[PDB]
Amino acid sequence: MAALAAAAKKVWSARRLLVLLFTPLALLPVVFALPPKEGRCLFVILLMAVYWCTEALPLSVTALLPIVLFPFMGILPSNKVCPQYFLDTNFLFLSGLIMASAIEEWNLHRRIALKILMLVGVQPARLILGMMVTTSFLSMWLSNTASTAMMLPIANAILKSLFGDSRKEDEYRRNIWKGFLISIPYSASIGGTATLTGTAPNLILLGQLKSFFPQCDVVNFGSWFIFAFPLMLLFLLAGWLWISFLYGGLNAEDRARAVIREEYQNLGPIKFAEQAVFILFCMFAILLFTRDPKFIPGWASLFNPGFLSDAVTGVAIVTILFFFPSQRPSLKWWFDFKAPNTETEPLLTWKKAQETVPWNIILLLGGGFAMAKGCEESGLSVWIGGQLHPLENVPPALAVLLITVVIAFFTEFASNTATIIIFLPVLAELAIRLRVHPLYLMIPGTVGCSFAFMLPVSTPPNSIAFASGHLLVKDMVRTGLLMNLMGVLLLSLAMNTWAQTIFQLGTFPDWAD
Amino acid sequence: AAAKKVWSARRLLVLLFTPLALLPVVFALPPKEGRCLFVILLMAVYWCTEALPLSVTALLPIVLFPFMGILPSNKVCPQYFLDTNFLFLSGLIMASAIEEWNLHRRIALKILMLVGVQPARLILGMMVTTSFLSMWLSNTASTAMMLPIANAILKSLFGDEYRRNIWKGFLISIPYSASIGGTATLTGTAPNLILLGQLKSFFPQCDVVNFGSWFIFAFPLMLLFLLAGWLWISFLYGGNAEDRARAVIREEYQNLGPIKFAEQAVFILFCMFAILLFTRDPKFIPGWASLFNPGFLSDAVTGVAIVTILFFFPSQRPSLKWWFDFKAPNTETEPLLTWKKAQETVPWNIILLLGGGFAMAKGCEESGLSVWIGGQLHPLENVPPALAVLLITVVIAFFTEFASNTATIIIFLPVLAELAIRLRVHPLYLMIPGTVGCSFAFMLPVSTPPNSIAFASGHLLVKDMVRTGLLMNLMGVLLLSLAMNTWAQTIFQLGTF
Ligand SMILES: CC(C)CCC[C@@H](C)[C@H]1CC[C@H]2[C@@H]3CC=C4C[C@@H](O)CC[C@]4(C)[C@H]3CC[C@]12C
Ligand SMILES: CC(C)CCC[C@@H](C)[C@H]1CC[C@H]2[C@@H]3CC=C4C[C@@H](O)CC[C@]4(C)[C@H]3CC[C@]12C
Ligand SMILES: CC(C)CCC[C@@H](C)[C@H]1CC[C@H]2[C@@H]3CC=C4C[C@@H](O)CC[C@]4(C)[C@H]3CC[C@]12C
Ligand SMILES: CC(C)CCC[C@@H](C)[C@H]1CC[C@H]2[C@@H]3CC=C4C[C@@H](O)CC[C@]4(C)[C@H]3CC[C@]12C
Ligand SMILES: CC(C)CCC[C@@H](C)[C@H]1CC[C@H]2[C@@H]3CC=C4C[C@@H](O)CC[C@]4(C)[C@H]3CC[C@]12C
Ligand SMILES: CC(C)CCC[C@@H](C)[C@H]1CC[C@H]2[C@@H]3CC=C4C[C@@H](O)CC[C@]4(C)[C@H]3CC[C@]12C
Ligand SMILES: CC(C)CCC[C@@H](C)[C@H]1CC[C@H]2[C@@H]3CC=C4C[C@@H](O)CC[C@]4(C)[C@H]3CC[C@]12C
Ligand SMILES: CC(C)CCC[C@@H](C)[C@H]1CC[C@H]2[C@@H]3CC=C4C[C@@H](O)CC[C@]4(C)[C@H]3CC[C@]12C
Ligand SMILES: CC(C)CCC[C@@H](C)[C@H]1CC[C@H]2[C@@H]3CC=C4C[C@@H](O)CC[C@]4(C)[C@H]3CC[C@]12C
Ligand SMILES: CCCCCCCCCCCCCC
Ligand SMILES: CCCCCCCCCCCCCC
Ligand SMILES: CCCCCCCCCCCCCC
Ligand SMILES: CCCCCCCCCCCCCC
Ligand SMILES: CCCCCCCCCCCCCC
Ligand SMILES: CCCCCCCCCCCCCC
Ligand SMILES: CCCCCCCCCCCCCC
Ligand SMILES: C[C@H](C(=O)O)[C@@H](C)C(=O)O
Ligand code: NA
Ligand code: NA
Numbered sequence A: 001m002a003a004l005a006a007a008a009k010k011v012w013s014a015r016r017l018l019v020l021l022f023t024p025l026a027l028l029p030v031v032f033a034l035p036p037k038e039g040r041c042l043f044v045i046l047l048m049a050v051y052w053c054t055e056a057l058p059l060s061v062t063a064l065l066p067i068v069l070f071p072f073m074g075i076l077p078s079n080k081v082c083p084q085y086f087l088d089t090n091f092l093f094l095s096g097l098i099m100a101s102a103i104e105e106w107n108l109h110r111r112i113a114l115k116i117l118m119l120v121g122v123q124p125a126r127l128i129l130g131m132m133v134t135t136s137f138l139s140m141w142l143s144n145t146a147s148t149a150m151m152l153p154i155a156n157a158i159l160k161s162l163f164g165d166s167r168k169e170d171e172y173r174r175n176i177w178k179g180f181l182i183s184i185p186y187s188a189s190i191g192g193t194a195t196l197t198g199t200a201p202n203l204i205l206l207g208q209l210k211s212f213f214p215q216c217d218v219v220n221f222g223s224w225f226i227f228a229f230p231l232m233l234l235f236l237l238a239g240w241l242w243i244s245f246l247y248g249g250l251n252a253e254d255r256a257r258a259v260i261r262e263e264y265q266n267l268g269p270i271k272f273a274e275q276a277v278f279i280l281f282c283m284f285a286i287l288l289f290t291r292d293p294k295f296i297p298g299w300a301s302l303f304n305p306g307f308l309s310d311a312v313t314g315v316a317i318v319t320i321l322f323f324f325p326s327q328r329p330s331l332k333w334w335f336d337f338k339a340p341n342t343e344t345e346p347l348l349t350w351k352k353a354q355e356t357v358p359w360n361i362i363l364l365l366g367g368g369f370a371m372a373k374g375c376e377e378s379g380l381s382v383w384i385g386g387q388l389h390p391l392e393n394v395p396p397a398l399a400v401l402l403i404t405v406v407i408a409f410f411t412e413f414a415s416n417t418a419t420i421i422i423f424l425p426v427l428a429e430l431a432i433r434l435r436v437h438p439l440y441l442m443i444p445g446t447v448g449c450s451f452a453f454m455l456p457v458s459t460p461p462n463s464i465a466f467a468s469g470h471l472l473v474k475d476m477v478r479t480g481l482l483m484n485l486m487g488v489l490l491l492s493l494a495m496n497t498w499a500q501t502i503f504q505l506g507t508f509p510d511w512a513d
Numbered sequence B: 001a002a003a004k005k006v007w008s009a010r011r012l013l014v015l016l017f018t019p020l021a022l023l024p025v026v027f028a029l030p031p032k033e034g035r036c037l038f039v040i041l042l043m044a045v046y047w048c049t050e051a052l053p054l055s056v057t058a059l060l061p062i063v064l065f066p067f068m069g070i071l072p073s074n075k076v077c078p079q080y081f082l083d084t085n086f087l088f089l090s091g092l093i094m095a096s097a098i099e100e101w102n103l104h105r106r107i108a109l110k111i112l113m114l115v116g117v118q119p120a121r122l123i124l125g126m127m128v129t130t131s132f133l134s135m136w137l138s139n140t141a142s143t144a145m146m147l148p149i150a151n152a153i154l155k156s157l158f159g160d161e162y163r164r165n166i167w168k169g170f171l172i173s174i175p176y177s178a179s180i181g182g183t184a185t186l187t188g189t190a191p192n193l194i195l196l197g198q199l200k201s202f203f204p205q206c207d208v209v210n211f212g213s214w215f216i217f218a219f220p221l222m223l224l225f226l227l228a229g230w231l232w233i234s235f236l237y238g239g240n241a242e243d244r245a246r247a248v249i250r251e252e253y254q255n256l257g258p259i260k261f262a263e264q265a266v267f268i269l270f271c272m273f274a275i276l277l278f279t280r281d282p283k284f285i286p287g288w289a290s291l292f293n294p295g296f297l298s299d300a301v302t303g304v305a306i307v308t309i310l311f312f313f314p315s316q317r318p319s320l321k322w323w324f325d326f327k328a329p330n331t332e333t334e335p336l337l338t339w340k341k342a343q344e345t346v347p348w349n350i351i352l353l354l355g356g357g358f359a360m361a362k363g364c365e366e367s368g369l370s371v372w373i374g375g376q377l378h379p380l381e382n383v384p385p386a387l388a389v390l391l392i393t394v395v396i397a398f399f400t401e402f403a404s405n406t407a408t409i410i411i412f413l414p415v416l417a418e419l420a421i422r423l424r425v426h427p428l429y430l431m432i433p434g435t436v437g438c439s440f441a442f443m444l445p446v447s448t449p450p451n452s453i454a455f456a457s458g459h460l461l462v463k464d465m466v467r468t469g470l471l472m473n474l475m476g477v478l479l480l481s482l483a484m485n486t487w488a489q490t491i492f493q494l495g496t497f
Helices: A002-013 A015-033 A036-054 A059-063 A065-072 A078-086 A088-105 A108-120 A124-138 A144-162 A168-192 A200-212 A221-246 A252-265 A272-290 A310-320 A350-355 A359-377 A380-387 A396-410 A416-433 A439-448 A460-467 A473-497 A499-503 B002-008 B010-028 B031-049 B054-058 B060-067 B073-081 B083-100 B103-115 B121-134 B139-157 B161-182 B190-202 B211-236 B241-256 B261-280 B299-310 B339-344 B348-366 B369-376 B385-399 B405-423 B428-438 B449-455 B462-486
Strands: none
Touching (some): A059 A065, A059 A359, A059 B339, A065 A078, A078 A088, A078 B083, A108 A144, A124 A144, A144 A168, A200 A359, A200 A439, A221 A439, A221 A473, A310 B060, A350 B348, A359 A380, A359 A416, A439 A499, A473 A499, B002 B010, B031 B369, B060 B348, B073 B348, B083 B103, B083 B261, B083 B348, B103 B241, B121 B161, B139 B261, B139 B449, B261 B299, B348 B449, B385 B428, B405 B428
């Protein structure tokens, strides 16, 4: 008995090398079964999928596999695979990352978070709602991991202040602790879906949409925001109600208010750099939203059609961060000859942007884009579409429900970005076969791959929440089951009621054929 | 007194007042070409004056080209990751892997043992080695592999102004050496092969150009200009204590200890990367790239394939007895290089720099600026042929500081052929000097990817690179003219037509 356990532990210890070596051997027969080009493309796609799910290699490193394999297998030349990694979607992501780095550099995010928590209240239900709305709004522009990692200390400080008898009161104490510590990552994950720059899978959707359907241009920052933000708010409210119900039982408050006040005043008086960064971020968001909302002609209409994008706007905005002064200019500096000649500092130096930008996610997005390109050009997409004949009789709404459920179940064990990268061509081909708008199935999958609530390995915010040490896997799975159910239902509602008027999903687009 | 105040805010002053100074360019030449020229010059001056960080300037095409109609955003953006950048990225990750395991320390200490810490002997040896290896490979791969040794040596012999001065000089010696070495052979650089192809296209009867003739012509050029550049760099940068240095280097060398498994594994990966780079596709003997589809493979595939091994190959010696030893702990082994350290120690800024350079090239080639320059250079046909070839050499050497060597040679070579035909001079007299000049790129990071690879360290400023580049370009033009007018007349029999 002990020998079997020892052998299992030993083989689990070297899981990465074993899976790396044995995945290609297991995946040889798909090459023989399928036509050469299609078989090789499916082989490399499945190899990347398994490597991503198992984490045999770093996700960014696995994203570089097409460079090795597409030329070797003859799927695509190297000079065509390589440029896929910096499609304009990746310059949009990069502008969002630079803006987020500027926001975190001057502690603007902490100031906004503390202000919202001050405004919302201190009552446990009010505090749950305020912390969730704070994390959701703050993850719309920042990363989910950073938002969770910053909101955890604030929650711990607030609870320590609040709780600074028998079993009822202290059991309520643990219940409130669990509720606060679990409401942060779920809210971060929900709020990441509101904006394209909020999370990577939305940008995966953009890149693979430009790949599979070059003429599709109805998804941008404004349309995605107006579609997802109401859905984000509805899902956040549902999650708040559920979490307060299960945990919150739906002088101390003075102490919590005092501690949050003293935490806010620890930031000192607001700095000129803070106003500059906030105004730049507001201009960034407005310009991205108003570039082309598809129902008021944006400022991109008066320029040359088909030339501008969100990437150019984001890069243009974040360029100003690298030369705008961080100290208030004064005209009297010129006149005062005895004034010091100290060199001024920009709002964001490039060193900070270099060391506070996740280039690994950029490489992952690029790998997804290039894999989509290779799958399209190798003819694997049409092969999958032909093989999907038995599913042509499923009603489109039922198909959306099933694909959302499948992807939301799959994302509980793999990263959201890898999940959507793997599943998006399948959804594209299924939508083509069903004679329905491709976005009507792509967007459900893109949103639902972020519905990772049940496990710590589902999404790094959940990993941080578990690392807080006050949460159990049972609590997270119990909450996340209903979180996934409500998310799927609300997503179906959104895709069947108001996504139709936004993305014009009612009619099959002509560019889909 | 106000001069100090003005100089204190030099960056903002130049950033605001440079577009205004460059406005007359837009109206001088046709608008499609004028806007592209304006963008090119704006980026050049921003790089020279360091008004913006090198990458922020490198991101300028994203803003400029789509707004003024030069090139769509979805066409500008994919240029920042051409396959040339995947070759640079893999070289950077390999250099980081070498640095992490202290293999660079061992290599540099062995080099110091073989040579000594005598000033400028290191720079001469490293320069000649870089040129020799660049003889058969592309300049990009050669400099990408040579920067790790340069950083190793520099970090080793130095453990105040002299230290940084030698640092800058010995780093800048590498891309220049690669550019000098690549022009000596037909296989050294792409423009030579492009010249052969276009010559076969235009002049099938002309067959006096080949590997032997080109070597016997250009090897003296490479040696002469390499020695001249070595003297220039040594003089500008850096002009018994020696026994004590020898001794202490010795004791520290034996205090390194035995070579670890990780060090030799990384060294073998580096050697395999170099060999697969050389043997991928030589133009005199077919390489393993001929076993696959034509033109589907490149140095990027080799670099990424080799570097992928670094992220999973174990950093400790594996033993089969571990499986049988059930009492041994089941602790996972760290790979040769984790992605965290790679992301920490890779200059993505200069990935963006090469990208901006490629965008500049494509914007120039798509806006018609290159064709406009070729057409405007026409009236140079009313000058004696010696002055003609000298002016072609100088204009190409200055032009190639902005465009890549392949791009500029593709632009100018048909112009050179038609100028030679119209002027009634034997074509080679202008074909060869243009091909040699297009390799004379020493002033800007955009000029050639080796310059950006040199910039990778971050201690090298554009100002000193330009300072060396002026004299380097002038000396190259002088030597090329001397070669074409002294011994290239007989080798190619180009004195008669
Ligand atoms: C190494 C581990 C993780 C791999 C897990 C997935 C494996 C078991 C799966 C993925 C794709 C699968 C293959 C897909 C298609 C075919 C063709 C069919 O005519 C015979 C089975 C065969 C050949 C399957 C065998 C099992 C297979 C290789
Ligand atoms: C000032 C900062 C925040 C930039 C954002 C300004 C917004 C409000 C501006 C910029 C471009 C503008 C548009 C430009 C052109 C047109 C077409 C015209 O027939 C009606 C107005 C309309 C549709 C404008 C509406 C307002 C607009 C969208
Ligand atoms: C737009 C044109 C006409 C004028 C531009 C003037 C610019 C360059 C001037 C105006 C005010 C100046 C600032 C005034 C005060 C200081 C503080 C001191 O530590 C020097 C830097 C710094 C931050 C100056 C930087 C340069 C500055 C921003
Ligand atoms: C949170 C829950 C309880 C509310 C949302 C439930 C979902 C599943 C409901 C609400 C609105 C519904 C849609 C409303 C109307 C139509 C049009 C009909 O021709 C086909 C079904 C379809 C497309 C429905 C599918 C199911 C649907 C999306
Ligand atoms: C920012 C600083 C360092 C730039 C210095 C060089 C600038 C001022 C120079 C370099 C070359 C110059 C151009 C050269 C030739 C012409 C053609 C003439 O018919 C109008 C002016 C115009 C278009 C010049 C404008 C100014 C110019 C662009
Ligand atoms: C340091 C000196 C060389 C200036 C910097 C280099 C650039 C900015 C200069 C060098 C020579 C210049 C060119 C000289 C002559 C002409 C022809 C005229 O009809 C339009 C402007 C144009 C095309 C100039 C544009 C600017 C230019 C390309
Ligand atoms: C020593 C390690 C790194 C392995 C690499 C060895 C190199 C030098 C070997 C291995 C396989 C060889 C190739 C095998 C077959 C052919 C086809 C033939 O028509 C021309 C030579 C060519 C293209 C060979 C060139 C040299 C080659 C690439
Ligand atoms: C090729 C197939 C058939 C077999 C592959 C065996 C591989 C996975 C085995 C063989 C030897 C093993 C190593 C032997 C010893 C150790 C030290 C211990 O701390 C575990 C990790 C490490 C470093 C092992 C990692 C896994 C390993 C490399
Ligand atoms: C800015 C980068 C891309 C290129 C380097 C500067 C270019 C634009 C400059 C350098 C030298 C210049 C040439 C110098 C002299 C002449 C002769 C006459 O006919 C006017 C135009 C013409 C032909 C100029 C055209 C522009 C030119 C080619
Ligand atoms: C170790 C990660 C990379 C493994 C690559 C294996 C490639 C195998 C290709 C098999 C299909 C083509 C046969 C001609
Ligand atoms: C480093 C791993 C390299 C694997 C290369 C696999 C190549 C498989 C295809 C070979 C033939 C291509 C033309 C039909
Ligand atoms: C009383 C209000 C003071 C505001 C100070 C900060 C202003 C920052 C302006 C930034 C503008 C950026 C785009 C040009
Ligand atoms: C239609 C006018 C074209 C010529 C002027 C263009 C000016 C662009 C200025 C860009 C400045 C970027 C750095 C601040
Ligand atoms: C952020 C700076 C933007 C500068 C935009 C300059 C645009 C110049 C060209 C305008 C007309 C384009 C069509 C001919
Ligand atoms: C690696 C050292 C050089 C090896 C080749 C030397 C000879 C030149 C190529 C062979 C053909 C020469 C005539 C075209
Ligand atoms: C040659 C000296 C003895 C040791 C041989 C093995 C050293 C490690 C080699 C790693 C090679 C990795 C790529 C195949
Ligand atoms: C620019 C390019 C060239 O010279 O053609 C690179 C440097 C190469 O050596 O191939
Ligand atoms: Na986020
Ligand atoms: Na997930």
